[PDB]
């Protein structure tokens, strides 16, 4: 349906790459270097978690648990 767009899956893949980058940018030394990076990765993780939870609950609305 709306969440099964041909390009929305590419958006999800790009989001996964962004999540990989963010988790690669989560170190005590990196945060000490740039606490702004700490805030940025927190916000990115929050957005990605929101999107992935939404798509998971939408997907499970059709297929059984």
Curated annotation (Swiss-Prot):
Residues on Extracellular side: 28-35
Family affiliation: Belongs to the NALCN family.
Job of this protein: Voltage-gated ion channel responsible for the resting Na(+) permeability that controls neuronal excitability. NALCN channel functions as a multi-protein complex, which consists at least of NALCN, NALF1, UNC79 and UNC80. NALCN is the voltage-sensing, pore-forming subunit of the NALCN channel complex. NALCN channel complex is constitutively active and conducts monovalent cations but is blocked by physiological concentrations of extracellular divalent cations.
Tissues/organs with expression: Predominantly expressed in the brain, moderately in the heart and weakly in the pancreas.
Post-translational events: Phosphorylated on tyrosine residues.
Protein name stated in the entry: Sodium leak channel NALCN
Subunit details: Found in a complex with NALCN, UNC79, UNC80 and NACL1; these auxiliary subunits are indispensable for the function of NALCN channel. Interacts with UNC80; required for the NALCN activation/inhibition by GPCRs in neurons. Found in a complex with NALCN, UNC79 and UNC80; UNC80 bridges NALCN to UNC79. Interacts with CHRM3.
Transmembrane regions: 7-27, 36-60
Cell compartment(s), UniProt: Cell membrane
Free-text note on domains in this protein's UniProt record: Contains 24 transmembrane helices (TM) that form four homologous functional repeats connected by intracellular linkers. Each of the four internal repeats contains five hydrophobic transmembrane segments (S1, S2, S3, S5, S6) and one positively charged transmembrane segment (S4). S4 segments represent the voltage-sensor. S4 transmembrane segments lack some of the charged residues (K and R) found at every third position in the S4s of the NaV, CaV, and KV channels.
Top-level taxonomy: Eukaryota, Metazoa, Chordata, Craniata, Vertebrata
